[PDB]
RNA sequence: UAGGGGCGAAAGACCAAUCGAACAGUCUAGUUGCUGGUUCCCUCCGAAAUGUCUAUCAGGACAGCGCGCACGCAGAGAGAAG
RNA sequence: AUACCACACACAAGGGAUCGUUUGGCUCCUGGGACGAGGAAGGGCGCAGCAGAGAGCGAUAUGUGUGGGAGCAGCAGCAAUGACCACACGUCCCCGAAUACAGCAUAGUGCUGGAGUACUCCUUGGAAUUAAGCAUAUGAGUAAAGGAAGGAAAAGAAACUAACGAGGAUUCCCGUAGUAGCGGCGAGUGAACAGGGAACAGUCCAACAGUGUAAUUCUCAAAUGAGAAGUUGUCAAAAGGAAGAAGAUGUGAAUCAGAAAGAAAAGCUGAACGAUACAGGGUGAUAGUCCCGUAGUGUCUUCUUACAUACGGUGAGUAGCUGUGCUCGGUAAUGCACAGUGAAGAGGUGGCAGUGUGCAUCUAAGACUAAAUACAACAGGAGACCGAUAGCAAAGAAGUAGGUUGACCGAAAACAGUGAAAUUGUGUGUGGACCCGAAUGGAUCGGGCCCGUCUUGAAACACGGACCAAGGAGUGCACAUACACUGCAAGUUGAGCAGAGGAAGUCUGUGAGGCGUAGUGAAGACGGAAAGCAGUGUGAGUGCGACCCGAUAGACUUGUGAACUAUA
């Protein structure tokens, strides 16, 4: 049960809040679980998927496959994974997008600011965990 | 019964809704309100309301209800003001009850019926009828006038 | 108009007439509760309500009933040995418009003042009361009751001499 | 109807209270006396400086001829109240004497 | 020069296809004893177009004739005999 | 009937009903109530790499600083030398109160003007309508038109009620009461004190300021001088504080596998695990453990609020009176005005005109005041509400496309689902307008005028109806009433309001009033039969749009028109 009356439980309001999200709230939509080993290598339980990271598909047509993230579509919430595609009548191949939550991370791309992003989150935990 | 279907729901499919084909249901065939009473409605007034068209009586431009409000009790009910447990004590006991009508919001005593128990009683009130006084004195009781 | 009825008299002719609904009743009740609570903290050890006199009701219809009034008179306060400035400091209400015209009415209101003075307790600071765990009084102070009395009995020899 | 059951005699009864006497306020202090004196004095100076008004002249003339009832009627019509007329006649009479 | 106002060699003519009182918008869902319409099934009972009063005569009300619920109960839309 | 006309069935056309769905509407509650000469509200014009509309922004038309951190939706190019977002600031073209102006105050600086006006205050002031006609009266001191202010506004501490054994500012709720009364005494109108509560608070000016010295306010200088206002009278004292409330934001448990089958499992089957968290939303079908939250817990930032001096009893074109007009329930004047007339220092009132006299209660003609009460724009939360002919006019570039000379007027269009009927073509069958009864291998036999509606009377030479879908008309509230059902009963009751409670529900108090416990009279006065109260519903009367649609007309505006036509 919910006892805070400032938070809404309306279906109409929850749905609008989802689809009209922007900025950091949009980034929260692209989160995926880490594998059991990585959850010992790092403190975090889940992270936003980025290009170059390595993922196992755990639901759908392409179940059991593994591959590298090629692109991240923020407007239509989908991820393109290397080697997951369909062939047209022409023989031409189109990558099919997968929803973030159907993936699981196997190796992290550590290019750019990723190491600082991870550090910032670990500290935020401990700050309140140790109190 | 606590609930029942309405008549309007049975009249679906029947043309006139029960007002007649020749007479119909028009807006105000007889006039508005209680008007017409000396004219076309004279028969309703003379049958049910004969003392309507008149002026009568003495006039005071302001009256006060609190100064005139009163409530009346009969002698046959005096013993009834006491609780039933109390009644049953004073019936056998050697003592005389002292009843004050002011305490129950009664101010005038009337002479109706006979006293419930034929033993003495003291009655306090603002006014007594002549019959009431005679009945209370008959049993050796006493009437006390008070404000 | 047909049949037998009490003749109508329903006053709905005026087109400018306003309607007032009461859908807010439970919510406004909750607000009044929450305002009293917070007001009670601001003056923690002290009661929220002041002490008031007992007066007799107005007409012939209500003579025999007693009620709370607005404030004590300068004469009542003085007779009980207090001064007006002190009475205010201790939570007694004052009304300088009222007059005294009876012996009885004066004597009763003096008793209230002396009773109240006796039941009080004084503190140096708020923290002292907090540490003693004093629980603040709620509602009106020393309200009248006006119950119905009980039937008295009397011996036959007395009847001639007292008349109830 | 729970109205008009008692007679007027019994409605006139009353409970026997014990009364308190009224505190008389007759003493008037020194400073209050001088205050009243100065006000009455000031009223003299105005009358001395500016004199009587037209209807006051006409009124006083009638008093010399003993036209008492004419003066009464005249003053009633000027001031409105029969009480004010009775007072103003007495003040005018005293002024002439 | 503008609406109970204009303008008229006068026809009640003309004042934005509108004039014996313009247009726009509101009061206003103005009023109607008058015309039109008024949405499912089966079962049981079943009328009136007459009298009195009405600024009443295409309308009302009161009484008379229907139906529902029914306290109760020796009666009858027919004959004899005085 | 070879080919025309009709009907039935299958296939193809034609249209958009039905069912499934919804980032919209509506209603109630809570917060908020924030504009302008420092140029507003509203109008116009410019700004993109390819750019019409709309959104955003001003020639700085994506600049600066802080907190974050991954892409910029198409094509070409950009980006850890910071893509994109959030908070504040800087810049901010022309018209518009539009002002190089008008009126006005101070020693001086200045202030007003326009916008908005649901709610509050002050003026001015209708008619339709009801009376079965209509003129007084009603609708109504309402609509319309003007002036003005704030988050509320107005009111407010008795020249007050009352006749009790009396009370004691204003406002609001329950109530007295559809009563006392007003009224072609017709239709209809219509208050006050009490009694029970919410919230509570009182004070200022004049009359009346040190005379052994205006002690008072302001300016420049200076470290103690000059000057302005003022004797037609200036000047009557404290810092100070912790509480209370609202927001923003951090953290936050626990799952794997399988036959059959499907595009896809979260379903189904077995085995586990979390819970102070099974509110709700998202994921390719119905998820506590896949993602965002929730229960529980941390931080931080704003706002609100608090001690000093001196006094009383005469505030005038006023109160009142005569005439007059409007107004109120106010009745031989309830309130407000105008003209004549016009007080006393002592006066005003006690619901019916006058005169006298005791008694009770107050102090007008100067000012300020919290709380409890009302309601748009804008924000947040809820619902026995509506579901694209509905719900706001408007679920998309809606006050838009478009229209009036003008004031003003104003639409359609959801899913690239499903895919009804009217109506059309082709094929196959059966008939010559069709229905009811009864049949043949086969000619057919018998009965039937076109429905709805007013009417004594309709197949009518009475009216409405070409065809199909969808929408489309006895409802809600107040007041008496008769019946059926329910609890208690000489009594009865969910008045408002308080106490408890993770709460618009429920439980418990305190405690009025109303009707009943018996009637008669105009009244003084008198007294002697008959179960009631409160609900849940049904039939029926009256008032409000009042079963649905429909006049010719009447009024009101600080609204518009001489581009047609008349005359100077
Ligand atoms: K009904
Ligand atoms: K009927
Ligand atoms: K009909
Ligand atoms: K009449
Ligand atoms: K409560
Ligand atoms: K001409
Ligand atoms: K013409
Ligand atoms: K006209
Ligand atoms: K008629
Ligand atoms: K029959
Ligand atoms: K007739
Ligand atoms: K009848
Ligand atoms: K203004
Ligand atoms: K009429
Ligand atoms: K009529
Ligand atoms: K109106
Ligand atoms: K105010
Ligand atoms: K004021
Ligand atoms: K009062
Ligand atoms: K009270
Ligand atoms: K979690
Ligand atoms: K699975
Ligand atoms: K998923
Ligand atoms: K005064
Ligand atoms: K005057
Ligand atoms: K005052
Ligand atoms: K529309
Ligand atoms: K347009
Ligand atoms: K469709
Ligand atoms: K289709
Ligand atoms: K017809
Ligand atoms: K014919
Ligand atoms: K016809
Ligand atoms: K009705
Ligand atoms: K109409
Ligand atoms: Mg009829
Ligand atoms: Mg007829
Ligand atoms: Mg009497
Ligand atoms: Mg008395
Ligand atoms: Mg006939
Ligand atoms: Mg007819
Ligand atoms: Mg007429
Ligand atoms: Mg009128
Ligand atoms: Mg009126
Ligand atoms: Mg208006
Ligand atoms: Mg003074
Ligand atoms: Mg689903
Ligand atoms: Mg009037
Ligand atoms: Mg009077
Ligand atoms: Mg639908
Ligand atoms: Mg629509
Ligand atoms: Mg045109
Ligand atoms: Mg005929
Ligand atoms: Mg036709
Ligand atoms: Mg339909
Ligand atoms: Mg009543
Ligand atoms: Mg009886
Ligand atoms: Mg209608
Ligand atoms: Mg007329």
mmCIF file of N, CA and C (backbone and C1' of nucleotides) in Angstrom, chain A residues 1-5 8-9 11-16 18 20 22 27-28 33 45-46 50-51 60-61 99 101-102 113 120 128, chain F residues 22-25 68-71 250-251 253-254 263-265 278-284 290-293 295 381-382 504:
data_model
loop_
_atom_site.group_PDB
_atom_site.id
_atom_site.type_symbol
_atom_site.label_atom_id
_atom_site.label_comp_id
_atom_site.label_asym_id
_atom_site.label_seq_id
_atom_site.Cartn_x
_atom_site.Cartn_y
_atom_site.Cartn_z
ATOM 1 N N UNK A 1 0.846 -1.221 0.000
ATOM 2 C CA UNK A 1 0.000 0.000 0.000
ATOM 3 C C UNK A 1 0.866 1.251 0.000
ATOM 4 N N UNK A 2 0.311 2.306 -0.594
ATOM 5 C CA UNK A 2 0.921 3.618 -0.697
ATOM 6 C C UNK A 2 0.213 4.533 0.295
ATOM 7 N N UNK A 3 0.996 5.260 1.104
ATOM 8 C CA UNK A 3 0.436 6.174 2.089
ATOM 9 C C UNK A 3 0.774 7.635 1.799
ATOM 10 N N UNK A 4 1.622 7.896 0.806
ATOM 11 C CA UNK A 4 1.964 9.253 0.423
ATOM 12 C C UNK A 4 0.949 9.730 -0.611
ATOM 13 N N UNK A 5 0.273 10.851 -0.322
ATOM 14 C CA UNK A 5 -0.799 11.339 -1.177
ATOM 15 C C UNK A 5 -0.323 12.314 -2.254
ATOM 16 N N UNK A 8 0.841 10.006 -7.594
ATOM 17 C CA UNK A 8 -0.380 9.615 -8.295
ATOM 18 C C UNK A 8 -0.416 8.115 -8.562
ATOM 19 N N UNK A 9 -1.627 7.544 -8.580
ATOM 20 C CA UNK A 9 -1.850 6.145 -8.918
ATOM 21 C C UNK A 9 -2.813 6.003 -10.093
ATOM 22 N N UNK A 11 -3.862 5.648 -13.960
ATOM 23 C CA UNK A 11 -3.334 5.019 -15.162
ATOM 24 C C UNK A 11 -3.009 6.051 -16.239
ATOM 25 N N UNK A 12 -3.883 7.045 -16.400
ATOM 26 C CA UNK A 12 -3.742 8.117 -17.367
ATOM 27 C C UNK A 12 -2.503 8.957 -17.072
ATOM 28 N N UNK A 13 -2.231 9.225 -15.789
ATOM 29 C CA UNK A 13 -1.124 10.080 -15.387
ATOM 30 C C UNK A 13 0.221 9.360 -15.467
ATOM 31 N N UNK A 14 0.283 8.105 -15.006
ATOM 32 C CA UNK A 14 1.477 7.285 -15.098
ATOM 33 C C UNK A 14 1.935 7.075 -16.543
ATOM 34 N N UNK A 15 0.999 6.852 -17.466
ATOM 35 C CA UNK A 15 1.315 6.642 -18.869
ATOM 36 C C UNK A 15 1.866 7.906 -19.521
ATOM 37 N N UNK A 16 1.286 9.072 -19.231
ATOM 38 C CA UNK A 16 1.765 10.308 -19.827
ATOM 39 C C UNK A 16 3.174 10.627 -19.350
ATOM 40 N N UNK A 18 5.495 8.547 -18.546
ATOM 41 C CA UNK A 18 6.421 7.649 -19.218
ATOM 42 C C UNK A 18 6.836 8.231 -20.567
ATOM 43 N N UNK A 20 6.340 11.064 -22.191
ATOM 44 C CA UNK A 20 6.745 12.453 -22.365
ATOM 45 C C UNK A 20 8.017 12.807 -21.585
ATOM 46 N N UNK A 22 11.997 13.280 -20.552
ATOM 47 C CA UNK A 22 13.122 13.951 -21.203
ATOM 48 C C UNK A 22 14.336 13.932 -20.274
ATOM 49 N N UNK A 27 17.097 8.708 -19.671
ATOM 50 C CA UNK A 27 18.204 7.775 -19.485
ATOM 51 C C UNK A 27 17.823 6.620 -18.559
ATOM 52 N N UNK A 28 17.010 6.876 -17.529
ATOM 53 C CA UNK A 28 16.598 5.803 -16.638
ATOM 54 C C UNK A 28 15.881 4.688 -17.395
ATOM 55 N N UNK A 33 19.990 -5.246 -16.344
ATOM 56 C CA UNK A 33 20.750 -5.968 -15.325
ATOM 57 C C UNK A 33 22.165 -6.386 -15.725
ATOM 58 N N UNK A 45 24.131 -2.747 -9.479
ATOM 59 C CA UNK A 45 23.273 -3.848 -9.897
ATOM 60 C C UNK A 45 22.752 -3.667 -11.321
ATOM 61 N N UNK A 46 22.648 -2.418 -11.800
ATOM 62 C CA UNK A 46 22.134 -2.120 -13.131
ATOM 63 C C UNK A 46 22.709 -0.802 -13.652
ATOM 64 N N UNK A 50 25.207 1.238 -23.321
ATOM 65 C CA UNK A 50 25.833 2.167 -24.260
ATOM 66 C C UNK A 50 26.466 1.403 -25.421
ATOM 67 N N UNK A 51 26.758 2.037 -26.583
ATOM 68 C CA UNK A 51 27.500 1.371 -27.652
ATOM 69 C C UNK A 51 28.775 0.698 -27.166
ATOM 70 N N UNK A 60 12.674 -13.446 -26.560
ATOM 71 C CA UNK A 60 12.244 -13.118 -27.915
ATOM 72 C C UNK A 60 12.797 -14.083 -28.963
ATOM 73 N N UNK A 61 12.803 -13.637 -30.230
ATOM 74 C CA UNK A 61 13.268 -14.404 -31.380
ATOM 75 C C UNK A 61 14.753 -14.742 -31.268
ATOM 76 N N UNK A 99 14.048 -4.167 -26.885
ATOM 77 C CA UNK A 99 13.752 -3.339 -25.725
ATOM 78 C C UNK A 99 14.801 -3.583 -24.644
ATOM 79 N N UNK A 101 15.070 -4.031 -21.446
ATOM 80 C CA UNK A 101 14.864 -4.912 -20.308
ATOM 81 C C UNK A 101 14.978 -6.388 -20.683
ATOM 82 N N UNK A 102 15.030 -6.701 -21.985
ATOM 83 C CA UNK A 102 15.181 -8.070 -22.461
ATOM 84 C C UNK A 102 16.656 -8.462 -22.642
ATOM 85 N N UNK A 113 33.644 8.536 -20.075
ATOM 86 C CA UNK A 113 33.347 8.924 -18.707
ATOM 87 C C UNK A 113 32.813 7.770 -17.850
ATOM 88 N N UNK A 120 30.711 7.532 -9.062
ATOM 89 C CA UNK A 120 29.722 8.443 -8.507
ATOM 90 C C UNK A 120 28.548 7.706 -7.857
ATOM 91 N N UNK A 128 25.100 6.460 2.671
ATOM 92 C CA UNK A 128 23.883 6.223 3.437
ATOM 93 C C UNK A 128 23.857 4.818 4.048
ATOM 94 P P U F 22 -6.021 1.276 -23.641
ATOM 95 O "O5'" U F 22 -6.356 2.802 -24.003
ATOM 96 C "C5'" U F 22 -5.299 3.582 -24.601
ATOM 97 C "C4'" U F 22 -5.759 4.970 -24.991
ATOM 98 C "C3'" U F 22 -5.894 6.017 -23.869
ATOM 99 O "O3'" U F 22 -4.983 7.135 -24.009
ATOM 100 C "C1'" U F 22 -7.620 6.206 -25.493
ATOM 101 P P U F 23 -3.506 7.030 -23.375
ATOM 102 O "O5'" U F 23 -3.033 8.564 -23.313
ATOM 103 C "C5'" U F 23 -3.403 9.402 -22.189
ATOM 104 C "C4'" U F 23 -2.531 10.642 -22.159
ATOM 105 C "C3'" U F 23 -2.920 11.807 -23.090
ATOM 106 O "O3'" U F 23 -2.561 13.072 -22.539
ATOM 107 C "C1'" U F 23 -0.714 11.134 -23.551
ATOM 108 P P G F 24 -3.668 14.047 -21.906
ATOM 109 O "O5'" G F 24 -4.819 14.193 -23.027
ATOM 110 C "C5'" G F 24 -5.173 15.517 -23.551
ATOM 111 C "C4'" G F 24 -6.602 15.559 -24.052
ATOM 112 C "C3'" G F 24 -7.652 16.095 -23.079
ATOM 113 O "O3'" G F 24 -7.509 17.509 -22.866
ATOM 114 C "C1'" G F 24 -8.518 14.225 -24.254
ATOM 115 P P G F 25 -8.054 18.168 -21.501
ATOM 116 O "O5'" G F 25 -9.633 17.889 -21.578
ATOM 117 C "C5'" G F 25 -10.507 18.870 -22.183
ATOM 118 C "C4'" G F 25 -11.905 18.317 -22.200
ATOM 119 C "C3'" G F 25 -12.751 18.547 -20.946
ATOM 120 O "O3'" G F 25 -13.383 19.830 -20.963
ATOM 121 C "C1'" G F 25 -12.967 16.295 -21.675
ATOM 122 P P G F 68 27.983 17.504 -9.866
ATOM 123 O "O5'" G F 68 27.554 17.113 -11.366
ATOM 124 C "C5'" G F 68 27.191 15.748 -11.654
ATOM 125 C "C4'" G F 68 25.907 15.687 -12.446
ATOM 126 C "C3'" G F 68 25.926 14.732 -13.641
ATOM 127 O "O3'" G F 68 25.646 13.426 -13.160
ATOM 128 C "C1'" G F 68 24.809 16.734 -14.211
ATOM 129 P P G F 69 26.458 12.216 -13.836
ATOM 130 O "O5'" G F 69 26.205 12.434 -15.404
ATOM 131 C "C5'" G F 69 25.073 11.803 -16.052
ATOM 132 C "C4'" G F 69 25.064 12.228 -17.500
ATOM 133 C "C3'" G F 69 25.884 11.355 -18.465
ATOM 134 O "O3'" G F 69 25.224 11.245 -19.743
ATOM 135 C "C1'" G F 69 26.708 13.550 -18.511
ATOM 136 P P A F 70 24.270 9.993 -20.105
ATOM 137 O "O5'" A F 70 23.986 10.299 -21.655
ATOM 138 C "C5'" A F 70 23.582 9.246 -22.561
ATOM 139 C "C4'" A F 70 24.177 9.472 -23.940
ATOM 140 C "C3'" A F 70 25.237 8.445 -24.361
ATOM 141 O "O3'" A F 70 25.203 8.166 -25.752
ATOM 142 C "C1'" A F 70 26.089 10.598 -24.655
ATOM 143 P P G F 71 24.139 7.107 -26.319
ATOM 144 O "O5'" G F 71 23.459 7.905 -27.542
ATOM 145 C "C5'" G F 71 22.297 8.751 -27.307
ATOM 146 C "C4'" G F 71 22.661 10.209 -27.487
ATOM 147 C "C3'" G F 71 22.148 10.913 -28.744
ATOM 148 O "O3'" G F 71 20.757 11.231 -28.655
ATOM 149 C "C1'" G F 71 24.396 11.526 -28.343
ATOM 150 P P G F 250 17.361 12.365 -6.704
ATOM 151 O "O5'" G F 250 18.161 11.544 -5.557
ATOM 152 C "C5'" G F 250 19.605 11.686 -5.479
ATOM 153 C "C4'" G F 250 20.108 11.129 -4.174
ATOM 154 C "C3'" G F 250 19.873 9.637 -3.909
ATOM 155 O "O3'" G F 250 20.875 8.827 -4.533
ATOM 156 C "C1'" G F 250 19.351 10.911 -1.978
ATOM 157 P P U F 251 20.417 7.530 -5.367
ATOM 158 O "O5'" U F 251 20.118 6.435 -4.224
ATOM 159 C "C5'" U F 251 21.209 6.015 -3.365
ATOM 160 C "C4'" U F 251 20.643 5.442 -2.089
ATOM 161 C "C3'" U F 251 19.840 4.140 -2.231
ATOM 162 O "O3'" U F 251 20.718 3.009 -2.271
ATOM 163 C "C1'" U F 251 18.759 5.648 -0.726
ATOM 164 P P A F 253 17.199 -2.792 -3.146
ATOM 165 O "O5'" A F 253 17.059 -4.346 -2.724
ATOM 166 C "C5'" A F 253 17.678 -4.857 -1.504
ATOM 167 C "C4'" A F 253 16.878 -6.015 -0.936
ATOM 168 C "C3'" A F 253 16.593 -7.192 -1.876
ATOM 169 O "O3'" A F 253 17.608 -8.179 -1.704
ATOM 170 C "C1'" A F 253 14.583 -6.531 -0.743
ATOM 171 P P A F 254 18.513 -8.695 -2.935
ATOM 172 O "O5'" A F 254 17.715 -9.967 -3.508
ATOM 173 C "C5'" A F 254 17.426 -11.076 -2.626
ATOM 174 C "C4'" A F 254 16.090 -11.662 -3.004
ATOM 175 C "C3'" A F 254 15.890 -11.986 -4.479
ATOM 176 O "O3'" A F 254 16.440 -13.280 -4.720
ATOM 177 C "C1'" A F 254 13.928 -10.963 -3.561
ATOM 178 P P A F 263 3.591 -19.014 -35.614
ATOM 179 O "O5'" A F 263 4.898 -18.297 -35.007
ATOM 180 C "C5'" A F 263 5.995 -17.937 -35.884
ATOM 181 C "C4'" A F 263 6.635 -16.651 -35.410
ATOM 182 C "C3'" A F 263 6.919 -16.546 -33.909
ATOM 183 O "O3'" A F 263 8.202 -17.089 -33.633
ATOM 184 C "C1'" A F 263 5.868 -14.559 -34.686
ATOM 185 P P A F 264 8.287 -17.949 -32.277
ATOM 186 O "O5'" A F 264 8.174 -16.847 -31.113
ATOM 187 C "C5'" A F 264 9.341 -16.088 -30.701
ATOM 188 C "C4'" A F 264 8.913 -14.897 -29.871
ATOM 189 C "C3'" A F 264 8.430 -15.177 -28.444
ATOM 190 O "O3'" A F 264 9.520 -15.126 -27.533
ATOM 191 C "C1'" A F 264 6.933 -13.688 -29.549
ATOM 192 P P A F 265 9.697 -16.250 -26.397
ATOM 193 O "O5'" A F 265 8.429 -16.074 -25.433
ATOM 194 C "C5'" A F 265 8.438 -14.982 -24.486
ATOM 195 C "C4'" A F 265 7.427 -15.222 -23.386
ATOM 196 C "C3'" A F 265 7.847 -16.131 -22.225
ATOM 197 O "O3'" A F 265 7.717 -15.373 -20.998
ATOM 198 C "C1'" A F 265 5.627 -16.577 -22.892
ATOM 199 P P C F 278 3.813 -2.481 -2.240
ATOM 200 O "O5'" C F 278 2.886 -3.766 -2.036
ATOM 201 C "C5'" C F 278 3.118 -4.877 -2.889
ATOM 202 C "C4'" C F 278 1.800 -5.465 -3.326
ATOM 203 C "C3'" C F 278 0.712 -5.631 -2.253
ATOM 204 O "O3'" C F 278 -0.558 -5.208 -2.768
ATOM 205 C "C1'" C F 278 1.131 -7.689 -3.343
ATOM 206 P P A F 279 -1.284 -3.940 -2.099
ATOM 207 O "O5'" A F 279 -0.615 -2.641 -2.755
ATOM 208 C "C5'" A F 279 -0.920 -2.361 -4.142
ATOM 209 C "C4'" A F 279 -1.368 -0.932 -4.326
ATOM 210 C "C3'" A F 279 -1.487 -0.501 -5.787
ATOM 211 O "O3'" A F 279 -2.728 -0.948 -6.342
ATOM 212 C "C1'" A F 279 -0.311 1.154 -4.602
ATOM 213 P P G F 280 -2.712 -1.865 -7.664
ATOM 214 O "O5'" G F 280 -2.138 -0.893 -8.796
ATOM 215 C "C5'" G F 280 -2.952 0.192 -9.286
ATOM 216 C "C4'" G F 280 -2.028 1.192 -9.941
ATOM 217 C "C3'" G F 280 -1.298 0.767 -11.225
ATOM 218 O "O3'" G F 280 -2.126 0.782 -12.406
ATOM 219 C "C1'" G F 280 0.200 1.907 -9.787
ATOM 220 P P G F 281 -1.790 -0.035 -13.761
ATOM 221 O "O5'" G F 281 -0.470 0.673 -14.316
ATOM 222 C "C5'" G F 281 -0.624 1.814 -15.179
ATOM 223 C "C4'" G F 281 0.754 2.347 -15.483
ATOM 224 C "C3'" G F 281 1.603 1.555 -16.479
ATOM 225 O "O3'" G F 281 1.245 1.832 -17.833
ATOM 226 C "C1'" G F 281 2.920 2.150 -14.635
ATOM 227 P P G F 282 1.159 0.600 -18.860
ATOM 228 O "O5'" G F 282 2.649 0.296 -19.368
ATOM 229 C "C5'" G F 282 3.422 1.363 -19.982
ATOM 230 C "C4'" G F 282 4.892 1.016 -19.924
ATOM 231 C "C3'" G F 282 5.307 -0.182 -20.773
ATOM 232 O "O3'" G F 282 5.374 0.204 -22.140
ATOM 233 C "C1'" G F 282 6.358 -0.298 -18.652
ATOM 234 P P U F 283 5.073 -0.997 -23.169
ATOM 235 O "O5'" U F 283 6.576 -1.549 -23.318
ATOM 236 C "C5'" U F 283 6.750 -2.881 -23.807
ATOM 237 C "C4'" U F 283 7.963 -3.520 -23.195
ATOM 238 C "C3'" U F 283 8.030 -4.990 -23.590
ATOM 239 O "O3'" U F 283 8.797 -4.953 -24.772
ATOM 240 C "C1'" U F 283 8.207 -4.797 -21.243
ATOM 241 P P G F 284 8.430 -6.033 -25.886
ATOM 242 O "O5'" G F 284 6.842 -6.298 -25.801
ATOM 243 C "C5'" G F 284 5.959 -5.931 -26.934
ATOM 244 C "C4'" G F 284 5.403 -7.117 -27.709
ATOM 245 C "C3'" G F 284 4.860 -8.320 -26.932
ATOM 246 O "O3'" G F 284 3.607 -8.787 -27.484
ATOM 247 C "C1'" G F 284 6.444 -9.052 -28.513
ATOM 248 P P C F 290 13.757 -10.553 -11.569
ATOM 249 O "O5'" C F 290 14.343 -9.366 -12.481
ATOM 250 C "C5'" C F 290 15.300 -9.675 -13.549
ATOM 251 C "C4'" C F 290 15.088 -8.779 -14.752
ATOM 252 C "C3'" C F 290 14.824 -7.306 -14.440
ATOM 253 O "O3'" C F 290 16.055 -6.619 -14.229
ATOM 254 C "C1'" C F 290 13.233 -8.105 -16.019
ATOM 255 P P C F 291 16.079 -5.385 -13.194
ATOM 256 O "O5'" C F 291 15.322 -4.213 -13.997
ATOM 257 C "C5'" C F 291 16.033 -3.351 -14.955
ATOM 258 C "C4'" C F 291 15.077 -2.328 -15.531
ATOM 259 C "C3'" C F 291 14.548 -1.282 -14.541
ATOM 260 O "O3'" C F 291 15.472 -0.232 -14.242
ATOM 261 C "C1'" C F 291 12.765 -2.098 -15.865
ATOM 262 P P C F 292 15.356 0.345 -12.746
ATOM 263 O "O5'" C F 292 14.113 1.349 -12.821
ATOM 264 C "C5'" C F 292 14.172 2.549 -13.640
ATOM 265 C "C4'" C F 292 12.833 3.239 -13.520
ATOM 266 C "C3'" C F 292 12.381 3.621 -12.108
ATOM 267 O "O3'" C F 292 13.004 4.786 -11.592
ATOM 268 C "C1'" C F 292 10.565 2.703 -13.269
ATOM 269 P P G F 293 13.220 4.883 -9.996
ATOM 270 O "O5'" G F 293 11.841 5.497 -9.434
ATOM 271 C "C5'" G F 293 11.352 5.178 -8.091
ATOM 272 C "C4'" G F 293 9.854 5.007 -8.180
ATOM 273 C "C3'" G F 293 9.074 4.802 -6.873
ATOM 274 O "O3'" G F 293 8.520 6.015 -6.307
ATOM 275 C "C1'" G F 293 8.559 3.052 -8.470
ATOM 276 P P A F 295 5.185 5.117 -0.016
ATOM 277 O "O5'" A F 295 5.494 4.076 1.155
ATOM 278 C "C5'" A F 295 4.389 3.397 1.807
ATOM 279 C "C4'" A F 295 4.922 2.240 2.619
ATOM 280 C "C3'" A F 295 5.965 2.577 3.691
ATOM 281 O "O3'" A F 295 5.354 3.045 4.895
ATOM 282 C "C1'" A F 295 6.675 0.701 2.454
ATOM 283 P P G F 381 -0.839 14.913 -9.537
ATOM 284 O "O5'" G F 381 -1.958 14.448 -8.489
ATOM 285 C "C5'" G F 381 -1.569 13.818 -7.241
ATOM 286 C "C4'" G F 381 -2.789 13.728 -6.353
ATOM 287 C "C3'" G F 381 -3.904 12.797 -6.838
ATOM 288 O "O3'" G F 381 -3.596 11.387 -6.735
ATOM 289 C "C1'" G F 381 -4.835 14.845 -6.054
ATOM 290 P P A F 382 -4.565 10.319 -7.466
ATOM 291 O "O5'" A F 382 -5.831 10.367 -6.473
ATOM 292 C "C5'" A F 382 -6.903 9.403 -6.608
ATOM 293 C "C4'" A F 382 -8.186 9.991 -6.073
ATOM 294 C "C3'" A F 382 -9.426 9.603 -6.876
ATOM 295 O "O3'" A F 382 -9.949 8.379 -6.359
ATOM 296 C "C1'" A F 382 -9.417 11.925 -6.594
ATOM 297 P P A F 504 -10.631 9.968 2.967
ATOM 298 O "O5'" A F 504 -11.634 11.205 3.171
ATOM 299 C "C5'" A F 504 -12.584 11.173 4.262
ATOM 300 C "C4'" A F 504 -13.910 11.762 3.849
ATOM 301 C "C3'" A F 504 -14.999 10.770 3.446
ATOM 302 O "O3'" A F 504 -16.201 11.341 3.961
ATOM 303 C "C1'" A F 504 -14.701 12.322 1.721
#
